Scaffold this active site. Structure first.
Site, PDB file in Angstrom:
ATOM      1  N   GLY A 119       9.618   2.058  -3.179  1.00 16.00           N
ATOM      2  CA  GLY A 119      10.827   1.316  -2.914  1.00 16.00           C
ATOM      3  C   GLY A 119      11.338   1.089  -1.516  1.00 16.00           C
ATOM      4  O   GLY A 119      12.139   0.145  -1.337  1.00 16.00           O
TER       5      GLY A 119
ATOM      6  N   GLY B  45       0.745  -1.247   0.000  1.00 20.54           N
ATOM      7  CA  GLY B  45       0.000   0.000   0.000  1.00 20.54           C
ATOM      8  C   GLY B  45       0.777   1.301   0.000  1.00 20.54           C
ATOM      9  O   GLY B  45       1.985   1.417  -0.112  1.00 20.54           O
TER      10      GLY B  45
ATOM     11  N   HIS C  97      -7.415  -5.049  -8.319  1.00 21.94           N
ATOM     12  CA  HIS C  97      -6.347  -4.222  -7.742  1.00 21.94           C
ATOM     13  C   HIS C  97      -6.407  -4.120  -6.236  1.00 21.94           C
ATOM     14  O   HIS C  97      -5.487  -4.603  -5.571  1.00 21.94           O
ATOM     15  CB  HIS C  97      -6.394  -2.877  -8.506  1.00 21.94           C
TER      16      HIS C  97
ATOM     17  N   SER D 179       5.498   7.358  -4.244  1.00 22.10           N
ATOM     18  CA  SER D 179       4.903   6.065  -4.546  1.00 22.10           C
ATOM     19  C   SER D 179       4.579   5.947  -6.022  1.00 22.10           C
ATOM     20  O   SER D 179       4.184   6.944  -6.657  1.00 22.10           O
ATOM     21  CB  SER D 179       3.575   5.967  -3.775  1.00 22.10           C
ATOM     22  N   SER D 180       4.559   4.717  -6.550  1.00 23.68           N
ATOM     23  CA  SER D 180       4.206   4.577  -7.978  1.00 23.68           C
ATOM     24  C   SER D 180       2.743   4.851  -8.266  1.00 23.68           C
ATOM     25  O   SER D 180       2.367   5.022  -9.428  1.00 23.68           O
ATOM     26  CB  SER D 180       4.559   3.150  -8.421  1.00 23.68           C
ATOM     27  N   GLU D 181       1.899   4.869  -7.225  1.00 17.73           N
ATOM     28  CA  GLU D 181       0.464   5.077  -7.357  1.00 17.73           C
ATOM     29  C   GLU D 181       0.053   6.481  -6.938  1.00 17.73           C
ATOM     30  O   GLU D 181      -1.120   6.744  -6.647  1.00 17.73           O
ATOM     31  CB  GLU D 181      -0.296   3.998  -6.567  1.00 17.73           C
TER      32      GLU D 181
END
Ligand SMILES: [Zn+2]
Ligand SMILES: [Zn+2]
Ligand SMILES: [Zn+2]
Ligand SMILES: [Zn+2]
Lengths: 205, 205, 205, 205
Positions: free
Chosen positions: D43, D27, D154, D70-72
């Protein structure tokens, strides 16, 4: 049997409940005291709870000044008046029990420990909006001859002589709930012990 | 191999069992000692247990004065007489094992670790009221060629050379129980390893 | 990159694995080292493990004197030779993964995180007796184009560049396993993402 | 309301989330701040997180120098612009919620606590590749009249006035998810409360 010793135990029961996987910051616990009860307050997360947060609600339903009792206090008072022998009440929304209350099913005699709640079943009382007098009456009728009941679309209520046994009983009914749902997904009906068999177990306890 | 070292281990096994998700203040543990056994007492929650609570029951079934042994002591004694090699006994009502005992099914060879209990299955002994001689006979017949057995509508018994391996085995059978119920809800029968395959694994252990 | 630092990490991975709900004193962990590997020993419970218990097995399959390597060491060596990029291997019998390996099914693309293992699936390699060369060949063929594989009637193997990512990946495949079994009990087949969709996700990682 | 106090809370929410069984190092959490937001970095495992790792992303989508958010992050920004009242956002891949998002189903009114998210359901927004503008639009449309939404194939997004209530809400929807999947495996449809009944509960909250 001072007020603070009783308040400390309430809090420890909350903490313990959370540790056993039954509470999720949604239950409420009380003890019979004086002419009414000591209950957990609404709105305070269990881990910030101190003895001074516990709320006293008299037999007329009047709560201490400047304290908000749990939003579900009325069926705690209903329990105490329906069962004179109950001295502590544990309510939670334990997942398995709640899932069984969504199917609106009673838990039948699939295991000999069903006798801890006093008979050959754990009933499921009908739905009524949380915090109402109508919910309170269904709870009072379900606890007349059992120490624990499911509440349709809601969760669980367990009562006993002290907090230790009320939590113990609450946990046992959540195990029974889990057993019934796990076996029900494989076969319907679920094999049960006969009434004769439960009558022996009851006598033995 | 003093009495207190053995009593300390019993207690640690209770604590460990609770931590692994198998006990729920309903099991009981014993060790073979002198001419009988050392067992957990009835009525005391595991966390209040001290070395001095552990109860000695002789080979005639006579327990120490002023101590109440577990209510399920008789099938601990049945285990010790049916299996001379067993030195510790672990009983619990672990949810998955118990759920399989409610379907009154044996656990078949769905995983190669079934060989830890000595064969190609974990049997399910028939129901009889807890604490009776009739229950004791079913347990004795089920443990003749296996180290663990389910007890219909009740739970599990596992025995081994010491408490470490008895708990280890008890946990392994609860994993096997979980695997069988999870796969049984998807497909019935559950694919098993052939008897030839289990015979190789047995030899290898 | 001394031997003890690597041995400490192995042990911490065991402890961590147990804490995440994947190990049950049945898995084994290794790291690539010198011309072979450092692996966990057979027979010692994880909590009694010290740096000096870790076993070195050379590239010829010869293990250090007076130490017994895990009973499943041969497919750790098979992994290292099939995948030159793998520097750590995690094997366990995690319940959901194992349950999927009992149905002898591959995990398909039900969630975009399936791409962490390198493709649109988690394969299930065929059964062969633990500790054999035949099991080792199936594992080597399954890891040719994936970083994790199920092992029919057995459990899981995951490999990666270090222990941190190998444990991370092992946990992710157990979540994927859980999702597939939970959805499979409701509907069969389980809706999946298309290969086009997985190809984008792969590129993105 | 300094930056570090907010960064400390983000981290504690990560830790708490992991302890509740919702996070699995997948998350991401944010808070509304200045003209944009403070979010967790991509990461770094949650347990190595320090106040100085938290990343500031302005209202134009520009992140602090030498830090990877974050990638999201893009659907965190979409949430803040779609719901002016939201001050914290919690996203995870909690197993039950995710399993319900794989069936591409909305969670209906099977329990009165569904009203915590603002209506008679928890919607399931359609799939789009993580990190895209297309995913961001679906999330923005799903949060227009609800505080939590599933994301097909997801996981979950929950938003509220502070991190405490956003985590609380996220946990409640995972319980609702569990209840629905457990009851759905037994009976399809699942009994629900009527819209009239939910309207009373909403008023009461
Ligand atoms: Zn309630
Ligand atoms: Zn028993
Ligand atoms: Zn193995
Ligand atoms: Zn995500």
């Amino acid at each position: 049997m001072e007020r603070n010793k009783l308040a400390r135990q309430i809090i420890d029961t909350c903490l313990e409940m959370t540790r056993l996987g039954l509470n999720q910051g949604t239950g409420n616990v009380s003890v019979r005291y004086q002419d009414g009860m000591l209950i957990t307050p609404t709105g305070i997360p269990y881990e910030k709870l101190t003895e001074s947060h516990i709320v006293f609600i008299d037999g007329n339903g009047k709560h201490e000044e400047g304290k908000l009792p749990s939003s579900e206090w009325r069926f705690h008072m209903a329990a105490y008046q329906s069962r004179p022998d109950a001295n502590a009440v544990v309510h939670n929304h334990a997942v398995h029990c709640t899932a069984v209350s969504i199917l609106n099913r009673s838990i039948p005699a699939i295991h000999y420990m069903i006798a801890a709640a006093g008979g050959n079943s754990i009933p499921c009382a009908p739905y009524a909006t949380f915090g109402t007098r109508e919910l309170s009456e269904h709870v009072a009728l379900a606890l007349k001859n059992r120490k624990a009941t499911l509440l349709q679309h809601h969760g669980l209520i367990a009562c006993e002589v002290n907090l230790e046994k009320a939590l113990w009983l609450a946990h046992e009914v959540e195990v029974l709930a889990q057993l019934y749902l796990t076996t029900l997904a494989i076969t319907d009906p679920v094999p049960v012990l006969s009434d004769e068999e439960i009558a022996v177990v009851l006598e033995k306890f």
